Amino acid sequence: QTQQLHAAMADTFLEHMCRLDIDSPPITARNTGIICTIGPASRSVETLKEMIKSGMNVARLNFSHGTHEYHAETIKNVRTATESFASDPILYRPVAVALDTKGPEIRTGLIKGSGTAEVELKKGATLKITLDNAYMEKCDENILWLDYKNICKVVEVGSKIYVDDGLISLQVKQKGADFLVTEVENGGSLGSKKGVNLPGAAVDLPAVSEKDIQDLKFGVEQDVDMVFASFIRKASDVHEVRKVLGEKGKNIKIISKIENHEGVRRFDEILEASDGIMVARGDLGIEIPAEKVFLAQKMMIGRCNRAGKPVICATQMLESMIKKPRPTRAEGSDVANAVLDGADCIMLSGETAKGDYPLEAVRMQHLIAREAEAAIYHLQLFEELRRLAPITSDPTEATAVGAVEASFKCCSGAIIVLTKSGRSAHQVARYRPRAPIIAVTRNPQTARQAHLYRGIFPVLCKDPVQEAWAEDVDLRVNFAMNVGKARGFFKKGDVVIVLTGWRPGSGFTNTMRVVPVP
Amino acid sequence: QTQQLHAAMADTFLEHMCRLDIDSPPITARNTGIICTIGPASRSVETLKEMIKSGMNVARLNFSHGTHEYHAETIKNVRTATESFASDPILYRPVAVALDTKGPEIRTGLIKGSGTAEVELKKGATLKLTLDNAYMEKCDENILWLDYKNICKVVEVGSKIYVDDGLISLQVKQKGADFLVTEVENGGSLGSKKGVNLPGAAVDLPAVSEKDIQDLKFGVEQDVDMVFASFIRKASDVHEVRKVLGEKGKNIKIISKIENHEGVRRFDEILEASDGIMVARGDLGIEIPAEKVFLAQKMMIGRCNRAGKPVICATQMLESMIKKPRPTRAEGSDVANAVLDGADCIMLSGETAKGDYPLEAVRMQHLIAREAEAAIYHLQLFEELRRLAPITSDPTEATAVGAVEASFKCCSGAIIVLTKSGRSAHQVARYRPRAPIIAVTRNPQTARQAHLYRGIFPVLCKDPVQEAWAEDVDLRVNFAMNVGKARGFFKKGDVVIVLTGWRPGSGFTNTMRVVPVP
Amino acid sequence: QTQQLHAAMADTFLEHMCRLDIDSPPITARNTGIICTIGPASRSVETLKEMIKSGMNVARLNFSHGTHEYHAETIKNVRTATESFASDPILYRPVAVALDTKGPEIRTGLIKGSGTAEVELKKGATLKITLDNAYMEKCDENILWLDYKNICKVVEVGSKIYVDDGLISLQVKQKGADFLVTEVENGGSLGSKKGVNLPGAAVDLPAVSEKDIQDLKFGVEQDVDMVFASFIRKASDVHEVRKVLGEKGKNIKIISKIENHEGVRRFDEILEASDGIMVARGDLGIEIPAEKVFLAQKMMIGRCNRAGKPVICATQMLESMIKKPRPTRAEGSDVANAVLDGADCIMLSGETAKGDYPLEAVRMQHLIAREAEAAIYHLQLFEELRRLAPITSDPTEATAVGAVEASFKCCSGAIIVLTKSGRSAHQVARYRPRAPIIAVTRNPQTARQAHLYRGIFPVLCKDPVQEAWAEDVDLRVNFAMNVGKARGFFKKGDVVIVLTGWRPGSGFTNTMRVVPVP
Ligand SMILES: O=P(O)(O)OC[C@H]1O[C@](O)(COP(=O)(O)O)[C@@H](O)[C@@H]1O
Ligand SMILES: O=P(O)(O)OC[C@H]1O[C@](O)(COP(=O)(O)O)[C@@H](O)[C@@H]1O
Ligand SMILES: O=P(O)(O)OC[C@H]1O[C@](O)(COP(=O)(O)O)[C@@H](O)[C@@H]1O
Ligand SMILES: [Mg+2]
Ligand SMILES: [Mg+2]
């Protein structure tokens, strides 16, 4: 009568749905990664401490706005908040830092010399688009300046332009030398420095701008865990980010953000070149028709699950929580369905960066994820992952699917994995066990990067290397036993799966043990 | 390449997801029924004409507010708009009328003049919780009193009272090892006349209030097609609505709204007694934890699909469209997932009743539904429905499963069903074909009520009765051919499935024909 | 294009059949146990050496015929032949001895004083059955003596009497006391001391006769590995055999032979009480209609597979090989299908006991088994075994299933299992891996008894117990590596699965390692 175990036993997906039970409580463990955008609502050390307690795993830094100095301070505050819990290694939670690039963005300028001024646009009205820098800070109801000098080369008569998250829509009725005559289709309030989308158009802006270069270099300096690369259209875009990160940033994970039609069409080559994917639904839902976004989301999650690569579901997941302490029913549904789709990580943007309820948003993601994780039809999911995964000679892959199989068979409270680089734990995660994967590492970057994968609950061991290797291994296993008991994942007498290797070093995971919790 | 046919052919659900394609266009046909709440934004004949054109199948009248005179005028306008298209029988769309009851409620507020003296709160104040009808109608600082009597017997200390339907949370504590105490907590504001809830309880209130009685009788007078019965807790509640509708309203469909923990717990008995179910997520999401609503939604949709009974997914599906001309990404997701879950109908409330963009909301539900319908994994869905449906001697059930099988085998443009009561078309809908079900009927109520079922595209035959019954049957088949050709569901030479019976009258459907479009 | 790996990957059983390929050669390893009845054709040390080389695993002694002296000599010769290979422990094959009881048989007397003398019986002719021992030696064309005293009390008028594996049929025409008068329906060559079947009748003979007692006692003295108990009707029959074997024979395996209606009806209780089952098709096909035998065979194999208990398919598998050096196509089919059904063991009776081609019969069973083992649809088989096997907390179960899963993932050349009692190896066999299970034991009886399980290739470790337990464990693993390499199951660099425990003694298997062959 716990964790949807009645639904778990169903012979059909339909019967599985019929058995979902609001009176069947989830396990304590939450498997889905929580990524939070840090901004003025969430930047203080004190707020960041509560974020972490509420379930934040990754701190996203959005490089659309702010200076390096601002970002360096945020990173410092994230690290201050994280390390305030280092005193108890059993309770310490690793926290990753993600750099989200600006990328090839298009923005308007200032309404009447102000950052906050708005004008109204009425349905049918003429609005002139200018690239004359004179009108940079002088936008209004009749004249709009935007920052893309090549707009006129790529737009035509009858093109649609979207302003402010696609809320304002324009139709190019007349095209000039370095200006556009448009008609307001969908009107509304136009404010300053709003995002512009050209869904029809082949936009000519660089994959990695000069600003993106400086930002990525800063990320290397700041020891960031991962890059969320905005507007990835093709594999060569990924390779440009990778080259910029260089040898010095070779271990930083590249997550390609898919937010245009091109990114979708060339998904396979992008996935192959990336460490994972973000379904960047914001821009994606402006670039392609809104009614198609769920198709692209489920296609990308599916392909990532098949590749064993991390996938993030991002944007407007709990949007109304910017202003309200409770989400709408669509938002509750969206979070649950991203989990059920297969997403490794769910994300908050404005909900944590600037909203009135950042901690409530985090808490809500935690609550929903855990409910949805119990509602997964693992019986079908594990059968299909097995059938679709290549037979290989890799001992670690064999140990991992065997451990996952074993975890289903004895209903284990956890899979404990010792890992240096994270790979052994990643290989377990790919097979989607119900039980949490406690990944024990001494590598602090490994501990942080592990949040990219569903189910991986990283624990940073800070006990010194014990001389007898077998004792050092047992120490780390016992550490995980202590964490799992303290977090209420399991109790003494329960069975857990333990994954180790036959010698120290990396690349030797080959041992699976079914052990009672002491 | 069309209607996700590549995804359709996948051997696994995971590969099916991998194959979902934003460049695979849907068919013209949309199967999911659209229910729109009518109010000041959508009440005019002229707006209602556009609502119908945009895809409105059912007009919901919410009896929480408004007089019978107001409602009678709305119903008149709906009928005026609908009948403006009666001139072309080929293109005429039937439009149903649904009466949504107030049901047993509570009504918060004493100070109520357009903009009330705010709830806001007051994390411990004097309002105050009373075991009496004494100090109710009194205010001296900031208080707002309700309309319900006996709270006790079915009560426990420290419970919650969600004012303005979940916009405000409450702390209310009585017993309480010290006197007969009260308490107040976290607030916001108030519009005018709110509500109170009592979680996990068995609430005693009448199923059918005196007001409900008058509105149900009004519904019979106004020839409504269906009743959405509010706050159904048990089968005897449904039987009370049924008795109130009486012999005169015996053909009016009763849709039980599942609104609370009891309604979820007693779901099976409610379902058996009802004509269908509404997943009333608004109240449900206040009554149970918000993070559990997706569980109850998927449980009820699944059980309804299993029973072959209509299920409506309701509340906040495109909520942000009240103020904005585009939905959020969570809202697009929610609509698509309700359809993928298997909902027969999707609903709009404030989006069409009071919002700034009613037609855009309707259109968006139409676009999403049709995209999601192509993304259904029919291969698994039809296998599971067959495996789980009882073998019976019923010739109609066997014919209707034969018709769906045949429709999958020849990739038919439609399933044409002659039906008097709708039952034969309902029986086809239960098996979830990809192709639209063109239900040809002379019964105008049948034509309207058929919108409750996924894929039933009702057509009201006006043509006079031909002399030879076989010729009158062929006339109605040809009528459906003409509708399908006009709507672009199919062209001359395409194959369709045709269902008829061996003699006139209801209950004799036993003939399935695979026929070319003339 | 080996081991039917193309057929292995099919999404359906039908496609799997379509992909079966005569040009796809099997591995080396043969999993199905081969049981050979030893008799005059096969009992010389020299022939027995070749039977072992040809693949004989179990030596069956049929106690319907022959003296203790004769059987003691056979057993001595089996042991002489087996031990001639003891010189190389790497190549030594353990060989089990099985005692097959006479049980409650009914046999005829001697034809005209001789045990080889044969009357040809006429169709339609009269034959008198007597219990008068005057005629017990004087059996002829018109007088046949049976050894069943209670014949007349259990066989009514009109009853069918079958003689000589059912080939001769007689109808009870005249029912008396001490005798019966019958007409030969199916005439033929009647010989001496032929089996009699009374399919209608409730035969009241003891489960364990006085001869059976002398025989089982002899089995205990002779250190037999297993008893094939004839004509088991009920669980109390198994308990009887178990009590007869007593403390002294407590480790001898009881295999209940199912060969009448009652034993099929009471199958579940029999199975629960036994160590395994023989499908004793000979008698079964006379006792129940011949056309039902395949139903009872597939039912019993299925239930045994589900229980993880050994099942033997027995009787007439290659019958024509008694006289011919090649089998019929029905016989090739029968062998292949018993393996495909999921039989742990196949058996030879007259083919090895008295036939002209015993080594050819053994060889043929080995060739067909190995071809059929490759044709198994493991994808469905392993999925179904998993779904149907209880979730338990048993660490060994979890390890055994983990092992089989891992073995499928890395296409391992073997699963190596250290076992004292055999149980850990039995637990792996239950889940049906494609790869052989090399069971390393120091227990010689364990090594012999392990032939009862599909895929278990037992190896008897002779090496002395090392002082360091970890070194003793590694020594046994290495021994299995050497066996596998020598038998061509795998080569250096290939991967294998290794199962061990955390401490010495039975019941602690919890460790699964994926190890390269040194
Ligand atoms: O996942 P990775 O990076 O391959 O690391 C797993 C490694 O961790 C271990 O369990 C322990 O290694 P250390 O003692 O070096 O920390 C190895 O046996 C194994 O090869
Ligand atoms: O779906 P229902 O109400 O059972 O109606 C189906 C009936 O319609 C028919 O096809 C036509 O009947 P009518 O000619 O009386 O309309 C019958 O043969 C069949 O029994
Ligand atoms: O199959 P069984 O009878 O439980 O034996 C398996 C046992 O063999 C071992 O691997 C080795 O035990 P021994 O050293 O006592 O032979 C144990 O760790 C394990 O419990
Ligand atoms: Mg973006
Ligand atoms: Mg027999």
mmCIF file of N, CA and C in Angstrom, chain A residues 12-15 17-18 20 22-23 165-167 261 281-282 285-286 290-292 294-295 298-299 302-303 306 316 326 328-330 333-334 336-337 341 368 371-372 380 384, chain B residues 12-15 17-18 20 22-23 261 265 281-282 285 290-292 294-295 298-299 302-303 306 316 325-326 328-330 333-334 336-337 341 368 371-372 380 384-385 388:
data_model
loop_
_atom_site.group_PDB
_atom_site.id
_atom_site.type_symbol
_atom_site.label_atom_id
_atom_site.label_comp_id
_atom_site.label_asym_id
_atom_site.label_seq_id
_atom_site.Cartn_x
_atom_site.Cartn_y
_atom_site.Cartn_z
ATOM 1 N N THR A 12 -0.777 -4.505 -17.775
ATOM 2 C CA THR A 12 -0.958 -3.531 -18.861
ATOM 3 C C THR A 12 -0.730 -2.135 -18.351
ATOM 4 N N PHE A 13 -0.346 -1.234 -19.271
ATOM 5 C CA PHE A 13 -0.207 0.174 -18.952
ATOM 6 C C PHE A 13 -1.562 0.774 -18.527
ATOM 7 N N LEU A 14 -2.653 0.356 -19.215
ATOM 8 C CA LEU A 14 -3.983 0.821 -18.887
ATOM 9 C C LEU A 14 -4.372 0.440 -17.451
ATOM 10 N N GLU A 15 -4.206 -0.825 -17.084
ATOM 11 C CA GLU A 15 -4.443 -1.257 -15.709
ATOM 12 C C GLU A 15 -3.547 -0.553 -14.699
ATOM 13 N N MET A 17 -2.464 2.557 -14.966
ATOM 14 C CA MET A 17 -3.139 3.841 -14.772
ATOM 15 C C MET A 17 -4.330 3.684 -13.805
ATOM 16 N N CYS A 18 -5.199 2.663 -14.017
ATOM 17 C CA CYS A 18 -6.367 2.362 -13.168
ATOM 18 C C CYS A 18 -6.025 2.185 -11.702
ATOM 19 N N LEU A 20 -3.397 3.661 -10.059
ATOM 20 C CA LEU A 20 -2.708 4.791 -9.421
ATOM 21 C C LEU A 20 -3.563 5.276 -8.249
ATOM 22 N N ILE A 22 -3.993 7.780 -4.850
ATOM 23 C CA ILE A 22 -3.700 8.994 -4.064
ATOM 24 C C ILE A 22 -3.465 8.685 -2.589
ATOM 25 N N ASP A 23 -3.808 7.462 -2.145
ATOM 26 C CA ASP A 23 -3.622 7.002 -0.775
ATOM 27 C C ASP A 23 -2.420 6.081 -0.620
ATOM 28 N N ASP A 165 8.584 36.809 -25.273
ATOM 29 C CA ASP A 165 8.061 35.450 -25.096
ATOM 30 C C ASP A 165 6.875 35.163 -26.007
ATOM 31 N N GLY A 166 6.925 35.759 -27.199
ATOM 32 C CA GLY A 166 5.967 35.496 -28.260
ATOM 33 C C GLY A 166 4.570 35.999 -27.965
ATOM 34 N N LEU A 167 4.440 36.903 -26.960
ATOM 35 C CA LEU A 167 3.156 37.482 -26.565
ATOM 36 C C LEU A 167 2.679 38.569 -27.537
ATOM 37 N N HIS A 261 13.610 25.222 -34.524
ATOM 38 C CA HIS A 261 13.293 24.182 -35.496
ATOM 39 C C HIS A 261 14.563 23.420 -35.960
ATOM 40 N N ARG A 281 11.932 24.937 -23.650
ATOM 41 C CA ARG A 281 10.551 25.076 -24.120
ATOM 42 C C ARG A 281 10.096 26.514 -24.373
ATOM 43 N N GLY A 282 10.737 27.476 -23.680
ATOM 44 C CA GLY A 282 10.500 28.906 -23.828
ATOM 45 C C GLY A 282 10.593 29.362 -25.268
ATOM 46 N N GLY A 285 8.844 26.915 -27.931
ATOM 47 C CA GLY A 285 7.424 27.202 -28.081
ATOM 48 C C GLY A 285 7.070 28.477 -28.795
ATOM 49 N N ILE A 286 8.062 29.325 -29.072
ATOM 50 C CA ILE A 286 7.884 30.482 -29.992
ATOM 51 C C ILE A 286 8.377 30.099 -31.417
ATOM 52 N N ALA A 290 3.261 26.287 -30.678
ATOM 53 C CA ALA A 290 3.081 25.899 -29.277
ATOM 54 C C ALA A 290 2.517 24.488 -29.077
ATOM 55 N N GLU A 291 1.575 24.090 -29.934
ATOM 56 C CA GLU A 291 0.910 22.788 -29.898
ATOM 57 C C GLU A 291 1.811 21.608 -30.284
ATOM 58 N N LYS A 292 3.039 21.872 -30.772
ATOM 59 C CA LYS A 292 4.003 20.859 -31.170
ATOM 60 C C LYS A 292 5.089 20.620 -30.128
ATOM 61 N N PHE A 294 5.197 19.559 -26.966
ATOM 62 C CA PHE A 294 5.108 18.251 -26.282
ATOM 63 C C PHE A 294 5.682 17.112 -27.150
ATOM 64 N N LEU A 295 5.486 17.196 -28.484
ATOM 65 C CA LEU A 295 6.040 16.222 -29.447
ATOM 66 C C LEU A 295 7.563 16.241 -29.359
ATOM 67 N N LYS A 298 8.827 15.022 -25.803
ATOM 68 C CA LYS A 298 8.782 13.555 -25.660
ATOM 69 C C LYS A 298 9.768 12.865 -26.625
ATOM 70 N N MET A 299 9.986 13.429 -27.823
ATOM 71 C CA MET A 299 10.984 12.872 -28.754
ATOM 72 C C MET A 299 12.395 12.987 -28.139
ATOM 73 N N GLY A 302 12.867 10.788 -24.896
ATOM 74 C CA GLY A 302 12.971 9.408 -25.363
ATOM 75 C C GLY A 302 14.331 9.055 -25.943
ATOM 76 N N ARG A 303 14.862 9.912 -26.839
ATOM 77 C CA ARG A 303 16.128 9.671 -27.512
ATOM 78 C C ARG A 303 17.314 9.751 -26.564
ATOM 79 N N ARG A 306 17.239 6.587 -24.364
ATOM 80 C CA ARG A 306 17.788 5.563 -25.256
ATOM 81 C C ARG A 306 19.337 5.690 -25.341
ATOM 82 N N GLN A 316 8.767 27.490 -17.628
ATOM 83 C CA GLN A 316 7.358 27.694 -17.286
ATOM 84 C C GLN A 316 6.705 26.522 -16.609
ATOM 85 N N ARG A 326 0.912 28.817 -4.711
ATOM 86 C CA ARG A 326 0.428 27.506 -5.163
ATOM 87 C C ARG A 326 0.474 27.456 -6.693
ATOM 88 N N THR A 328 -0.876 26.244 -10.659
ATOM 89 C CA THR A 328 -2.087 25.843 -11.359
ATOM 90 C C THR A 328 -2.054 24.305 -11.591
ATOM 91 N N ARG A 329 -3.208 23.747 -12.002
ATOM 92 C CA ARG A 329 -3.363 22.319 -12.233
ATOM 93 C C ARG A 329 -2.585 21.861 -13.450
ATOM 94 N N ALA A 330 -2.425 22.770 -14.446
ATOM 95 C CA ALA A 330 -1.618 22.498 -15.643
ATOM 96 C C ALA A 330 -0.160 22.361 -15.270
ATOM 97 N N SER A 333 0.474 19.059 -13.324
ATOM 98 C CA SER A 333 0.450 18.063 -14.387
ATOM 99 C C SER A 333 1.787 18.022 -15.214
ATOM 100 N N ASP A 334 2.291 19.196 -15.572
ATOM 101 C CA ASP A 334 3.468 19.372 -16.408
ATOM 102 C C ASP A 334 4.664 18.793 -15.767
ATOM 103 N N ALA A 336 4.646 16.524 -13.338
ATOM 104 C CA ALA A 336 4.480 15.073 -13.170
ATOM 105 C C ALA A 336 4.776 14.370 -14.495
ATOM 106 N N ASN A 337 4.290 14.942 -15.615
ATOM 107 C CA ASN A 337 4.457 14.350 -16.943
ATOM 108 C C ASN A 337 5.863 14.406 -17.458
ATOM 109 N N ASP A 341 7.666 11.203 -18.476
ATOM 110 C CA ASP A 341 8.244 11.120 -19.818
ATOM 111 C C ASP A 341 9.621 10.479 -19.745
ATOM 112 N N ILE A 368 6.197 16.841 -6.294
ATOM 113 C CA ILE A 368 5.589 16.275 -7.506
ATOM 114 C C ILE A 368 6.459 15.171 -8.100
ATOM 115 N N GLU A 371 6.148 11.924 -6.208
ATOM 116 C CA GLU A 371 4.867 11.291 -6.518
ATOM 117 C C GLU A 371 4.892 10.669 -7.890
ATOM 118 N N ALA A 372 5.452 11.369 -8.871
ATOM 119 C CA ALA A 372 5.471 10.896 -10.266
ATOM 120 C C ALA A 372 6.404 9.726 -10.477
ATOM 121 N N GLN A 380 7.336 -2.025 -17.715
ATOM 122 C CA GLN A 380 7.522 -1.743 -19.140
ATOM 123 C C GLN A 380 8.819 -0.969 -19.388
ATOM 124 N N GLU A 384 11.809 -2.306 -21.863
ATOM 125 C CA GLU A 384 12.089 -1.618 -23.123
ATOM 126 C C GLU A 384 13.539 -1.111 -23.197
ATOM 127 N N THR B 12 8.160 -0.609 -29.491
ATOM 128 C CA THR B 12 8.148 -0.241 -28.081
ATOM 129 C C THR B 12 7.567 1.144 -27.876
ATOM 130 N N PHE B 13 7.069 1.403 -26.658
ATOM 131 C CA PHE B 13 6.611 2.737 -26.289
ATOM 132 C C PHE B 13 7.761 3.745 -26.341
ATOM 133 N N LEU B 14 8.951 3.322 -25.895
ATOM 134 C CA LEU B 14 10.132 4.176 -25.891
ATOM 135 C C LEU B 14 10.508 4.580 -27.324
ATOM 136 N N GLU B 15 10.581 3.624 -28.249
ATOM 137 C CA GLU B 15 10.838 3.944 -29.653
ATOM 138 C C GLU B 15 9.732 4.812 -30.256
ATOM 139 N N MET B 17 7.985 7.123 -28.617
ATOM 140 C CA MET B 17 8.371 8.468 -28.168
ATOM 141 C C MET B 17 9.497 9.021 -29.039
ATOM 142 N N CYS B 18 10.572 8.235 -29.291
ATOM 143 C CA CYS B 18 11.736 8.623 -30.124
ATOM 144 C C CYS B 18 11.362 9.079 -31.519
ATOM 145 N N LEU B 20 8.342 10.506 -32.408
ATOM 146 C CA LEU B 20 7.428 11.654 -32.466
ATOM 147 C C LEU B 20 8.105 12.807 -33.224
ATOM 148 N N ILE B 22 7.739 16.631 -35.050
ATOM 149 C CA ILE B 22 7.126 17.960 -35.206
ATOM 150 C C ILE B 22 6.830 18.301 -36.692
ATOM 151 N N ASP B 23 7.444 17.549 -37.633
ATOM 152 C CA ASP B 23 7.259 17.727 -39.067
ATOM 153 C C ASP B 23 6.260 16.731 -39.680
ATOM 154 N N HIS B 261 -11.692 13.822 -1.749
ATOM 155 C CA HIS B 261 -11.080 12.545 -1.411
ATOM 156 C C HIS B 261 -12.131 11.420 -1.435
ATOM 157 N N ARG B 265 -12.259 8.005 -3.523
ATOM 158 C CA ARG B 265 -12.313 6.715 -2.816
ATOM 159 C C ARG B 265 -13.518 5.852 -3.244
ATOM 160 N N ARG B 281 -10.531 19.284 -11.354
ATOM 161 C CA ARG B 281 -9.195 19.424 -10.781
ATOM 162 C C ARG B 281 -9.054 20.606 -9.863
ATOM 163 N N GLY B 282 -9.876 21.640 -10.096
ATOM 164 C CA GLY B 282 -9.930 22.857 -9.292
ATOM 165 C C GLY B 282 -10.150 22.556 -7.838
ATOM 166 N N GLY B 285 -7.783 19.641 -6.409
ATOM 167 C CA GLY B 285 -6.488 20.193 -6.032
ATOM 168 C C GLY B 285 -6.444 21.035 -4.774
ATOM 169 N N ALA B 290 -2.019 19.083 -3.987
ATOM 170 C CA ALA B 290 -1.896 19.449 -5.389
ATOM 171 C C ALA B 290 -1.036 18.461 -6.190
ATOM 172 N N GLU B 291 0.052 17.951 -5.573
ATOM 173 C CA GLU B 291 1.003 17.025 -6.197
ATOM 174 C C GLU B 291 0.412 15.626 -6.478
ATOM 175 N N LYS B 292 -0.822 15.339 -5.977
ATOM 176 C CA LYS B 292 -1.503 14.059 -6.130
ATOM 177 C C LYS B 292 -2.576 14.085 -7.211
ATOM 178 N N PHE B 294 -2.572 14.612 -10.482
ATOM 179 C CA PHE B 294 -2.242 13.852 -11.703
ATOM 180 C C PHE B 294 -2.505 12.329 -11.513
ATOM 181 N N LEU B 295 -2.273 11.816 -10.277
ATOM 182 C CA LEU B 295 -2.568 10.429 -9.920
ATOM 183 C C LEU B 295 -4.055 10.166 -10.077
ATOM 184 N N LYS B 298 -5.203 10.477 -13.843
ATOM 185 C CA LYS B 298 -4.831 9.305 -14.647
ATOM 186 C C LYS B 298 -5.580 8.062 -14.172
ATOM 187 N N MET B 299 -5.877 7.941 -12.841
ATOM 188 C CA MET B 299 -6.669 6.824 -12.341
ATOM 189 C C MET B 299 -8.089 6.866 -12.961
ATOM 190 N N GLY B 302 -8.177 6.382 -16.901
ATOM 191 C CA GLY B 302 -7.956 4.953 -17.102
ATOM 192 C C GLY B 302 -9.197 4.115 -16.845
ATOM 193 N N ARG B 303 -9.857 4.310 -15.680
ATOM 194 C CA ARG B 303 -11.042 3.532 -15.290
ATOM 195 C C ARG B 303 -12.245 3.796 -16.169
ATOM 196 N N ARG B 306 -11.538 2.103 -19.545
ATOM 197 C CA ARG B 306 -11.842 0.713 -19.234
ATOM 198 C C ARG B 306 -13.346 0.446 -19.243
ATOM 199 N N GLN B 316 -8.185 24.997 -15.333
ATOM 200 C CA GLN B 316 -6.892 25.647 -15.482
ATOM 201 C C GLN B 316 -6.026 25.086 -16.596
ATOM 202 N N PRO B 325 -2.540 36.084 -25.046
ATOM 203 C CA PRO B 325 -3.089 35.423 -26.250
ATOM 204 C C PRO B 325 -2.429 34.085 -26.599
ATOM 205 N N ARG B 326 -1.335 33.718 -25.901
ATOM 206 C CA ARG B 326 -0.626 32.442 -26.032
ATOM 207 C C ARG B 326 -0.617 31.700 -24.688
ATOM 208 N N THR B 328 1.093 29.194 -21.605
ATOM 209 C CA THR B 328 2.416 28.772 -21.120
ATOM 210 C C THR B 328 2.753 27.337 -21.645
ATOM 211 N N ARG B 329 4.004 26.940 -21.493
ATOM 212 C CA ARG B 329 4.465 25.636 -21.949
ATOM 213 C C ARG B 329 3.864 24.487 -21.113
ATOM 214 N N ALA B 330 3.583 24.784 -19.813
ATOM 215 C CA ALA B 330 2.938 23.836 -18.902
ATOM 216 C C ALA B 330 1.510 23.563 -19.354
ATOM 217 N N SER B 333 1.513 21.440 -22.615
ATOM 218 C CA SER B 333 1.793 20.109 -22.091
ATOM 219 C C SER B 333 0.542 19.423 -21.476
ATOM 220 N N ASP B 334 -0.188 20.167 -20.607
ATOM 221 C CA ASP B 334 -1.325 19.673 -19.846
ATOM 222 C C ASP B 334 -2.408 19.211 -20.772
ATOM 223 N N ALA B 336 -2.040 18.361 -23.955
ATOM 224 C CA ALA B 336 -1.582 17.252 -24.773
ATOM 225 C C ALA B 336 -1.645 15.962 -23.944
ATOM 226 N N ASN B 337 -1.222 16.044 -22.656
ATOM 227 C CA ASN B 337 -1.206 14.889 -21.772
ATOM 228 C C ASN B 337 -2.554 14.403 -21.369
ATOM 229 N N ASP B 341 -3.480 10.779 -22.028
ATOM 230 C CA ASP B 341 -4.040 9.954 -20.940
ATOM 231 C C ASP B 341 -5.247 9.200 -21.436
ATOM 232 N N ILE B 368 -3.907 21.542 -30.147
ATOM 233 C CA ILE B 368 -3.183 20.601 -29.289
ATOM 234 C C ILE B 368 -3.777 19.200 -29.350
ATOM 235 N N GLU B 371 -2.887 17.370 -32.532
ATOM 236 C CA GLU B 371 -1.485 16.927 -32.455
ATOM 237 C C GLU B 371 -1.316 15.751 -31.515
ATOM 238 N N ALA B 372 -1.959 15.791 -30.326
ATOM 239 C CA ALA B 372 -1.817 14.723 -29.330
ATOM 240 C C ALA B 372 -2.481 13.406 -29.774
ATOM 241 N N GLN B 380 -0.354 -0.232 -28.817
ATOM 242 C CA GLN B 380 -0.530 -0.677 -27.438
ATOM 243 C C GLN B 380 -1.947 -0.396 -26.925
ATOM 244 N N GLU B 384 -4.423 -3.333 -25.464
ATOM 245 C CA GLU B 384 -4.771 -3.360 -24.044
ATOM 246 C C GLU B 384 -6.269 -3.287 -23.823
ATOM 247 N N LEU B 385 -6.979 -2.456 -24.610
ATOM 248 C CA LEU B 385 -8.451 -2.310 -24.516
ATOM 249 C C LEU B 385 -9.164 -3.623 -24.822
ATOM 250 N N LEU B 388 -8.482 -6.331 -22.004
ATOM 251 C CA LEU B 388 -9.157 -6.008 -20.755
ATOM 252 C C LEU B 388 -10.702 -5.943 -20.875
#
